[PDB]
Ligand binder design. Sequence first.
Ligand SMILES: Oc1nc(-c2ccc(C(F)(F)F)cc2)nc2c1CSCC2
Ligand SMILES: Oc1nc(-c2ccc(C(F)(F)F)cc2)nc2c1CSCC2
Ligand SMILES: Oc1nc(-c2ccc(C(F)(F)F)cc2)nc2c1CSCC2
Ligand SMILES: Oc1nc(-c2ccc(C(F)(F)F)cc2)nc2c1CSCC2
Ligand SMILES: Oc1nc(-c2ccc(C(F)(F)F)cc2)nc2c1CSCC2
Ligand SMILES: Oc1nc(-c2ccc(C(F)(F)F)cc2)nc2c1CSCC2
Ligand SMILES: [Zn+2]
Ligand SMILES: [Zn+2]
Ligand SMILES: [Zn+2]
Ligand SMILES: [Zn+2]
Ligand SMILES: [Zn+2]
Ligand SMILES: [Zn+2]
Lengths: 284, 284, 284, 284, 284, 284
Amino acid sequence: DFSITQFVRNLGLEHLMDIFEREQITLDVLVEMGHKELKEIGINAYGHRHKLIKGVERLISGQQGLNPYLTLNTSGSGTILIDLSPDDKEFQSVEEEMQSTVREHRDGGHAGGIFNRYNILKIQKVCNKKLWERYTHRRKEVSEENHNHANERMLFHGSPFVNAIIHKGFDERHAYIGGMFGAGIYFAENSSKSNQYVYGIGGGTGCPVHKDRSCYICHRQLLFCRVTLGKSFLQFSAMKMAHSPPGHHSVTGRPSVNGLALAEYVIYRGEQAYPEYLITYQIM
Amino acid sequence: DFSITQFVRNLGLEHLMDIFEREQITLDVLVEMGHKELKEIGINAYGHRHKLIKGVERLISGQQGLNPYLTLNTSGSGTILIDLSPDDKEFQSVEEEMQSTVREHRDGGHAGGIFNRYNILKIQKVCNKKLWERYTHRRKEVSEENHNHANERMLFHGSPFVNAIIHKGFDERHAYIGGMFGAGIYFAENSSKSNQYVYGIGGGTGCPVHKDRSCYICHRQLLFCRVTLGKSFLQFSAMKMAHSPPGHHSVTGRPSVNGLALAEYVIYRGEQAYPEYLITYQIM
Amino acid sequence: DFSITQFVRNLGLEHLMDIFEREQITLDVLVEMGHKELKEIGINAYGHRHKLIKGVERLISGQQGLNPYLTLNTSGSGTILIDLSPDDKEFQSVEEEMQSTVREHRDGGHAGGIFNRYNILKIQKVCNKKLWERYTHRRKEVSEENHNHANERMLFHGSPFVNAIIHKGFDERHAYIGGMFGAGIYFAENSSKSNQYVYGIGGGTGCPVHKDRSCYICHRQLLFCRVTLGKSFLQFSAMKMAHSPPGHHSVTGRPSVNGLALAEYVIYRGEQAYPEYLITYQIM
Amino acid sequence: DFSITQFVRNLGLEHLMDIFEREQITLDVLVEMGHKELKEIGINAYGHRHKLIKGVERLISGQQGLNPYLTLNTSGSGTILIDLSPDDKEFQSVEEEMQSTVREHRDGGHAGGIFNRYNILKIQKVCNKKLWERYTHRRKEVSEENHNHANERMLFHGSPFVNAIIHKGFDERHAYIGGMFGAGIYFAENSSKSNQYVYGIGGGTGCPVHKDRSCYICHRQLLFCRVTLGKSFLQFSAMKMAHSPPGHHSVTGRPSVNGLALAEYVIYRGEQAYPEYLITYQIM
Amino acid sequence: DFSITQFVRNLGLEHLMDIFEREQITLDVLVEMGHKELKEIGINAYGHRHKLIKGVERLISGQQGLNPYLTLNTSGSGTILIDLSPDDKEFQSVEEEMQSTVREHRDGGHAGGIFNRYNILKIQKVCNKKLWERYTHRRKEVSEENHNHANERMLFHGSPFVNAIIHKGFDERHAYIGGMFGAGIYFAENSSKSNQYVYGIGGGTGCPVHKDRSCYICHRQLLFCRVTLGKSFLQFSAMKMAHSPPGHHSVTGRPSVNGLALAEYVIYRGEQAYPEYLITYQIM
Amino acid sequence: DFSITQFVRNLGLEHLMDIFEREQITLDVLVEMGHKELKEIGINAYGHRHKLIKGVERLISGQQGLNPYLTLNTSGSGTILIDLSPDDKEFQSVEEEMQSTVREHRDGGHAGGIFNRYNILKIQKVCNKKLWERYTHRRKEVSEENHNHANERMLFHGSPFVNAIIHKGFDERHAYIGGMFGAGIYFAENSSKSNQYVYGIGGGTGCPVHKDRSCYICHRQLLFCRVTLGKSFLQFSAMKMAHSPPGHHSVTGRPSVNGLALAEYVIYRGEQAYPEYLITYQIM
Ligand SMILES: Oc1nc(-c2ccc(C(F)(F)F)cc2)nc2c1CSCC2
Ligand SMILES: Oc1nc(-c2ccc(C(F)(F)F)cc2)nc2c1CSCC2
Ligand SMILES: Oc1nc(-c2ccc(C(F)(F)F)cc2)nc2c1CSCC2
Ligand SMILES: Oc1nc(-c2ccc(C(F)(F)F)cc2)nc2c1CSCC2
Ligand SMILES: Oc1nc(-c2ccc(C(F)(F)F)cc2)nc2c1CSCC2
Ligand SMILES: Oc1nc(-c2ccc(C(F)(F)F)cc2)nc2c1CSCC2
Ligand SMILES: [Zn+2]
Ligand SMILES: [Zn+2]
Ligand SMILES: [Zn+2]
Ligand SMILES: [Zn+2]
Ligand SMILES: [Zn+2]
Ligand SMILES: [Zn+2]
């Protein structure tokens, strides 16, 4: 609470500090107050309010190159999870999407386990202002190309780094290099295909507690995400690449008799995906 | 009670949580509180209220694409039923509409049973904010056409799925495909004609308990519903159609010597009707 | 013409009419003018402005049931067509989508003719605020029923009634009754499949002038349209339906070995599609 | 052409078209005109101006989702080249940077040729508002992630695709996959190192006329580019990668006894570079 | 409060003084108030406002050579320190830069103590409008030379005069005369190299409390500063100079086998550096 | 040459090029022309002038970071010399200053020559906008640091590099390292003292032709200069320094019994001097 003290003292208005103390006014609060709000807390003289507002202008706009405003706007950022009520139709739509896309993989449940259904424990909306703005800026950019069409999908993602994704967003710097199309972030339209990646590549060693890849006790987590595909490149065979092909925004792997059994979607830029829903579940 | 905790924590205002605990302030409640409400519960410092209100703004307006307001506003919705007092004039009006509209149909009371009057047990006003707003939106849309006239009537509907209707509204995706005019929602001005369909088409198998189409014991339910007709297409013979004819908003089938014995009304959009009254009765 | 005169005379402000005559102030303009606008045109006396504003309020709100505002606000509505520059990236993306989706159809070019590419003459954007707001209202509804996802695609439509569509919107009361999936509105992802229907079902009799289905002279017109699919019902075999399946917002017919050659999409609500681009072209 | 005509006709103001014909007002000029400009061109009635302004607002903001403003505002975008005065200090400093960074390469000038200095013919500034805004947006992001420090450098780039870069910008979808640090975009702080690549990898086959990698006749083109490196990852030995290492924005390869003779810089996002100067020259 | 009294009395408007007394209006506030502001505080008559504003113009522009405006604008100038939150990425980037640039110095920690890591207590952003404007003016001047490139770096600085620097900026009149490149201001890209100078040349006599050059208790301060290097002159050997070499803006000392072990940067004009971050730490 | 063509072509206004070709409108002229000027040369349509002015705005301010305005505005810069009439009082006062400050030096005319007076051939006023602006900016800064008094003087400077000075300004990077007070720029108030330096330190070897330090035939040049001294440090005895003493702006060496015969003035910043008069003369 010292930056506000220095600011007010430099303005010559130290005798107002008691007011600022009782109202818990910090510098980041003060830089957002006008004549009306300053009058609300008892700064009655016009000269005082005018001096305060001019000081704020000199700090924020006069030294924009130092970005003091970004230094003052740290509070309130971060991710919050909002629980979806099981009786609401949004929860039910998400659960139906999870349940109705389960398939029987070529492996007998080795990577993901042996099951037919899920037991869903909760679903949470992920809210992060900065990540959402990054996503919408990129989505506008993609739709500006591609005749005003973002080509947005909602797709599943399984990863042992879900917490990192939800707090920091998707990142192609952490791409899946071993993927069929190479060095990309991978999403599936089938929930079981993404459940194959909950505990690592090929299932890893299973759950941390029992080291079982078909554990029916430990809570697993999946992501249901908004993915911007734009103009998507259709591919049937493996093709290692570092970025999207020229003139495209993503890659789509289609199932084939001698190739993929289920569809696959790859983006090479983290900002083209946003993790809307976090799903906690057990396999049954 | 965790989303509120995460929000307050990200704002750096954890020391206030005890207050939010005693007043049962959830996130859905907090997003609706201004300076006055926060001051009521004991948030006395202006700075704390300012931070909370700005955080709510960043969450609700800032991430409007994710629609957090809808996820928080699931509570309180849903249908409720209000009992009409038998001594009220509204109850007597509905009862008179029920009784005066009984007719002797061509069948010897096979479908609806053999009766001349009803014994009314209770009449319930159905209240559902979402369904009502959907219906009024459609009604304004229709009256905007058809020279500022909704052409609104109150008609009878009978169906074994009354509960689904009163909780989720009328749905043209559950239309009576086999009806004379084809794949729509059917209403009758005569309550007996609707009572013929309480247990299903042609009376079905009757009451579930006794499998009797003329049972005088089991309770029956009808719906007295607001229906928007707009510009109604007048018809006499059968005409299998999937939607309203061009330039109309419903079909009215009039009695004919070689056709209908009683009037019929068909709508082809589920939001062009609303179930205002649920009537519980027995045939006598 | 005389509305403004009557309104002004009823207020005893007839002497002002000369001003209203010079500034071409009609009643529909006047209902949108506050103190600042009225001061701009020279109503200098606060009392006259006060009387005018109160009278407008009593007309627009006091008699809202009559909807005088809708009567006054008819001017301006309607469709405009904004040409795309061939040098711009939007034009090139729309053209690339049109060209790359040509396919050889099972019939030897009987319906749409014999061609491998198009000569694109014009691409226009269709702007109509009322239709746009109808479509966006429906899109919000569907998305709220489908976990915040509209499932929006850009698809082709061909029809001999393109002009009526671009001015009146898509209407399910003019649905393709004889289609494979029932009475709805049909879209293709392949421009040639839609091109098969520009002159009518099966190509009709060809162009109006030469009565040739494979004419290389007459200008054709296709619609490139936003289509909200929401939760789509996947189908492989024909089945006729009047409306969407319960709990679904559209039908999609996927290619099958013994079934469809190319994908089809069907909506059953006119307001679930918006024609965003009108394309004028010839087959080569 | 006809867009302004349709727009004005829809508002019932066709009698103004003659004015709009003589002042060459198109819809894209009109949407930027207020009361003052409309007065300047002779629209003297306030009511007419009010109608035009409201129609524009209804098109632009009312139908934002269609992005008509983007459709209208295409004209004027694109690249322009501003020739630098050889007597000005900017030209001299760029030429000095070009000449003084020449070095003797390990090969006997096989890729680039045999020379000790250049004959500078032209130096041009590249101006493209869209590419510039893309670059500055990315720069703000990166510096926000690197304690308010973009870490901007001026580096040379040689490529056979200089024209595509100056008109479309740098694109990681056209990365040098064969480089020692993976699929990135490569820059050098020595003009001769980039001179080695103007005719292709290894100099290609030399100039298109004489097919001579050491031609002293044909004009060559090099780019001098602003590169945002952010937190750069230091590397002394080759290692192929698709994107930047975690927590980093670029890779810098440093000279080593058994490794690089000269420094290299690799970025993995096309928007992290802007081509500021286009240098035309010959080797002597 | 007397200058405003004299001003208003000379204008003949002494009867207004009461208002000015209650609103705490001083001459420094008044010189910035136009008609709207004077009306806000209750100067209702246009003539009084007109006289006030003309008097202010006669003072500010009419006697510019006396610079009364500067005499009135002293308040609000000065430095403020804004504390970075340890949970923010800015703080973490600065700390990572501090920790990762630690090296083992030729002296066994004689000057800077013995340690591998720091304990970072706090990091503050330094904000001074006037010093910032001096820096940005010099930066634009340098970049106007050096082909529109400031060549800006972020470098550490240690000094027993950090307070004087943050309140008055970098000053070449306090240059390090005995440095290897002579009478300049010295910065290091390695934190520990600058830590060696925190208590003076060669560490001085250690911390004042214990006179211990390797104290682990006392708090040390470093600066992380923006430095404009422009066209830097590369050097390897000691070279005493008073100013930059001709055509250059700074000197870069590069490591050599027989020379420096770590890089060094020297400016000869105090306005080419700005002290952005103040870091308080202990050696561990 | 082609910049204006590109700019106009990108706007779709190529048909106007003939006007621009006949009126010799280049891009640097065009960016300074508003509606009135464009009307003067015959751009009659308001729409065309509008497009031109908006394109200029997008270039100049939309891409301010590229500084295109500096690239365009190079022409017209440079020094001009304005001859003073030998009959004007300005010429006469400058000549009187030259003649009346001649002194007999301790050396026998070795460095400068043997003479009592000069023969003045020309006096020229040096006009260079950029150098003058740099001077006045520094002068403002100094006077703000010296109670509003810049302490400006008019003093003589002799140099073999007069041409470079009048075209580039004074430069501390070319300081007289061997001077009595260190690495600064030295000015005399006695013309003969500065005459001692027109052919180098200690007179060098004399004139280029006769290699004579007392040549009465060759044309020598002195500068009469406005020097900002600010707060000057008084010194009686030699002491070398690289910059001004702390809290000062210059050094003044007063004559002493064992020190200087004549006064000296030293600045350590090139921008604190401006060369006003170029004097051509011979000794007699
Ligand atoms: O949901 C998915 N996740 C991954 C995946 C995630 C994380 C990781 C890593 F361990 F972090 F490197 C590896 C692979 N791969 C795929 C899918 C679904 S589409 C098929 C591929
Ligand atoms: O009230 C009515 N209900 C039905 C009716 C209700 C339910 C069903 C279904 F079994 F659920 F599909 C079928 C028909 N049909 C009619 C009327 C009165 S007007 C004449 C026709
Ligand atoms: O683009 C299409 N148009 C029509 C179509 C349009 C109008 C009419 C009618 F003349 F009004 F009856 C009939 C059919 N059908 C289809 C497609 C492409 S998806 C396959 C079906
Ligand atoms: O300036 C440079 N350009 C390229 C370069 C440019 C274009 C291409 C391609 F033909 F398009 F694939 C390949 C390489 N590589 C390097 C440098 C300077 S640092 C060393 C590497
Ligand atoms: O950060 C640095 N500071 C100083 C430094 C600071 C203050 C003083 C003085 F005592 F005030 F004169 C002397 C030297 N020198 C160096 C560096 C880092 S690069 C190596 C040299
Ligand atoms: O006018 C003066 N010029 C110089 C002078 C000018 C240029 C040079 C050099 F060629 F660059 F090295 C050296 C010395 N020194 C002094 C004075 C008059 S006051 C006494 C000293
Ligand atoms: Zn387990
Ligand atoms: Zn029964
Ligand atoms: Zn034809
Ligand atoms: Zn050649
Ligand atoms: Zn200590
Ligand atoms: Zn001579």
